[PDB]
Design a protein around this ligand. Structure first.
Ligand code: PRP
Ligand code: PRP
Ligand code: 683
Ligand code: 683
Ligand code: MG
Ligand code: MG
Ligand code: MG
Ligand code: MG
Lengths: 346, 346
C-alpha cells in the first residue's frame, strides 16, 4: 500500500480494497503520516462517501492501539452514552446527564468522552466542573465502574497515538469521517449504547459498524440537528440489534412529552452546564429534565436489546419509568456525589 | 472567509462563492495556511469538481504574486508549449522539443516549465542537460527572448511563494486541481499556447480559464492519455478563441502521419532525453520527429488564432510546413546552439 494508491482511489470515487483503510489508519497512529496525508485522507474518504467496512477498519485500528481496561473488569452488559458532537447548537450536556441517570438505575455505564470541540462545554469539561476526575487510567476506571457503577474514559488518555490526527481535525475545522470515530472507539468496548450522530448522512454508516460488532445500539439524530434524542421534534433512530440495522422515526409525543423549543435546551460555560446537571438531579422539572429522561430511557432500551426477547414499546415504557425513578428517589444525585468522593479518595 | 467555511462548502459539493478560491490561494501563498489546510483544500476542490471561475481565481492569485517580466519585453504574440504532466507514460520531452522548433520558425516562445515530478526527466531537466540555463531571472529571460527568440521561465524561480503548495503536492502524491496551475501561470503571460492536460475530466475547465483571458489556445489530451497531441491514436482538443471553447476530435492520420506505438515515444533519464532532442533537430526521421512536428504545428495554429481571420485546415497545413522546414533547414538545431551560447556568455 501507499498514500498515492489509496488517495488516488478515493479521489476516483471508488470504495477502498479491504485492508486499505486499516493500513491508512495504522500509518496515522504510528506517526508515519504527514499532516497533509492525514488531511487528504480524512477529506477524500468523506467526499467519496465512507462505507461501514471502511469506517469499521478505521475504528478497529484505533482500538488495536488503545489502552485497554484490565481483563474481566467490564460487565458484558455495560453501556455507553456518547455522540459525535458537532451539532452546532451548544446544548446542555444531555449524554453526560443521561449517563449518570442510567448508572443510577443499575445499568453499568462506561462512558467515552472528551472536551468540547465547537461547543462552550463538552461532557468532559462539565464533569470536571462537577468535581469528577475525568482522566483516570485503565485500572482506576475499572475501579470506578465496580465501586460507583460508572466509569469515564477520557479519549486523549486512552488513545494517545491518535494525537496527530486529533491535531489535523482541529486545523481543518470541517467535519470529516474522523468525527465518527469517538463513539466507535470506547476502549472498554461496551456492547450496548445510545450513540448520537450530528451528521444525518453518516448515521447509517455508524450503525453499520455497530451491526458488524453485534452491539445493541440506538444511533440517534434529532430532526432538529441534535446528536441526541431531541424533545423539540422527531428524531431518526437507526436501531441496531442481531447484526441488523433498521431505520425508525421517533416521536416523544407518543410518550406524553411536551414539545420544547431548542432555546430551552441551550447550554453555557462549564459552570453553567454543571449547574444544569445539579438542577436536574435535584428534581427540577422542565424541558431539560424531559430531555435527560428521554435519553436515559433510550440507553436503557439499548441495554434491554442485549436480550433477544426484548420488545420495543415495553422497553421504552420500562426505560422511562426507571429513568424517572432514578432521579426521583435521589439515586442519581447520590451517585454523582459518590462518584466525586471516589475520585478524591484514590 | 475561513477554512471551515470554504472547506465546508466544498465538502457539501457546492461551488464556492466568488472570491473564496482566491482568498484560499492567497492564504496559501502568504504562508498563512497549515499543510493540513492546503491538502484539505486541494483535495476537496478536486472532488467537488472545480469550475473555470474557481481555477481562474487560483491562477490569478498566483500570477498576482509572481515575478513578472520587465515592461514591454514580451511580444503580444508570444506562445507557450507546456502541459500538466502526470500522464504516467514517461515520454520524451515533446513540449520542450516542439517549443524549440516553434521558436525556430519565427514565433516568439516563452515556455514555462519545471523539473520532473513522476517521469524520469522533465522539460527543465532535459534543457539543463542540453546546456541551456534554466536559472535565469526576469531580466535575463527577457533578454533570451529578444536575442535568441525563446525564453524559459523556471516555475520555482518565478513562483517562490508557491513553495508550501508545491511541498503538499509532493507529500500527497495524488493529482489535484493544483496540477492544472503550471500551464495557467506562465509569468510572462503569453496570449497563445499549446497546452497539454493529462486529466480528461479537467481539460474543459482549463480551456475555460484561457477563454476568460481571451487567449488563443489549444488544450490537448491524447486519447491514449498523453498530455500532448499524440501520434498513437486520436486526440481531443478544446479549441479556445474569441473567448469561446469548442471540443474537437483530432486525427493526425488526416495529415499523413503513420500510427505509432506508445513504446516508440518512451523517454529515459535527462541524458537520454537530451540525446533524443539532438537526434530530432539533427534530422532523424521516425516517430519522435513526427510527434514533435505535430505538436510544433499545434502551437503555430494557436499563434495563428490570435487573428480572427484564421482557418483550421489551412492553419494546420501551414503549421506543419513551417515546423518541418524549421527542422530541415537546420534552423532549429542552430537555434538550440545559439540558446546554449547565450547562457554561457551572460
Ligand atoms: O463541542 P462539540 O463538537 O459540539 O461536542 C459536544 C460534546 O458532545 C460529545 O460528547 P458527549 O456526547 O459525551 O457529551 P454531552 O454530554 O455534551 O452530550 C463531544 O465529545 C463533546 O463533549
Ligand atoms: O514528471 P511528469 O509529471 O510526468 O511531468 C513531465 C513533464 O511534463 C511537464 O512539462 P512540459 O510539458 O513543459 O515538458 P515536456 O512535455 O517537454 O516534458 C512537467 O512540468 C514535466 O516537466
Ligand atoms: C476519538 C478521539 C480520541 C482522541 C482525541 N484527541 C486526542 C488524542 C490524543 C492526544 C490528545 C487529544 C486531544 O484531543 O487533546 C480525539 C480528538 O480530539 O479528535 C478523538
Ligand atoms: C506552478 C508551480 C510553480 C512552482 C512549483 N514548485 C516550486 C515552487 C516554489 C519553490 C520550489 C518549487 C519546487 O518544485 O521545487 C510547482 C510544483 O512543483 O508543484 C508548480
Ligand atoms: Mg452527547
Ligand atoms: Mg450533544
Ligand atoms: Mg508536455
Ligand atoms: Mg508530456
Amino acid at each position: 500500500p501507499s498514500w498515492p494508491q489509496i488517495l488516488g482511489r478515493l479521489t476516483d470515487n471508488r470504495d477502498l480494497a479491504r485492508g486499505q483503510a486499516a493500513w491508512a489508519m495504522d500509518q496515522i497512529m504510528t506517526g508515519n503520516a504527514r499532516p497533509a496525508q492525514i488531511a487528504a485522507f480524512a477529506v477524500a474518504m468523506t467526499m467519496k462517501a465512507p462505507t461501514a467496512d471502511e469506517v469499521g477498519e478505521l475504528a478497529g485500528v484505533m482500538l488495536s492501539h488503545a489502552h485497554p481496561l484490565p481483563a474481566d473488569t467490564v460487565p458484558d452488559d455495560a453501556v455507553d452514552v456518547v455522540g459525535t458532537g458537532g451539532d452546532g447548537v451548544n446544548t446542555v450536556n444531555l449524554s453526560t446527564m443521561a449517563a449518570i441517570v442510567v448508572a443510577a438505575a443499575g445499568v453499568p455505564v462506561v462512558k467515552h468522552g472528551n472536551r468540547a470541540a465547537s461547543s462552550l462545554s463538552g461532557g468532559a469539561d462539565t464533569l470536571e466542573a462537577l468535581g469528577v476526575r475525568i482522566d483516570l487510567g485503565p485500572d482506576l476506571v475499572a475501579r470506578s465502574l465496580a465501586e460507583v457503577g460508572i466509569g469515564f474514559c477520557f479519549a486523549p488518555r486512552f488513545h494517545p497515538s491518535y494525537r496527530h490526527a486529533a491535531a489535523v481535525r482541529r486545523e481543518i475545522g470541517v467535519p470529516t469521517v474522523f468525527n465518527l470515530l469517538g463513539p466507535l472507539t470506547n476502549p472498554a468496548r461496551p456492547r450496548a449504547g445510545l450513540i448520537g450522530c450530528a451528521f444525518a448522512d453518516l448515521a447509517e454508516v455508524m450503525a453499520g459498524v455497530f451491526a458488524a460488532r453485534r452491539s445493541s445500539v440506538l444511533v440517534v439524530h434529532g430532526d432538529d440537528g441534535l446528536d441526541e434524542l431531541t424533545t423539540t421534534t422527531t428524531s431518526t433512530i437507526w436501531r441496531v440489534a442481531a447484526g441488523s440495522v433498521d431505520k425508525l422515526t421517533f416521536d416523544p409525543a407518543g410518550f406524553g412529552f411536551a414539545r420544547a423549543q431548542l432555546d430551552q435546551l441551550a447550554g453555557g460555560d462549564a459552570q453553567a452546564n454543571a449547574a444544569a446537571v445539579r438542577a436536574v438531579l435535584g428534581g427540577a422539572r422542565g424541558p431539560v429534565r424531559d430531555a435527560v429522561v428521554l435519553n436515559a430511557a433510550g440507553a436503557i432500551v439499548a441495554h434491554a436489546g442485549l436480550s433477544s426477547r426484548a420488545e420495543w414499546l415495553p422497553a421504552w415504557e420500562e426505560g422511562l419509568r426507571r429513568a424517572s425513578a432514578a432521579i426521583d428517589t435521589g439515586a442519581a444525585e447520590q451517585l454523582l456525589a459518590r462518584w466525586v468522593r471516589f475520585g478524591r479518595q484514590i
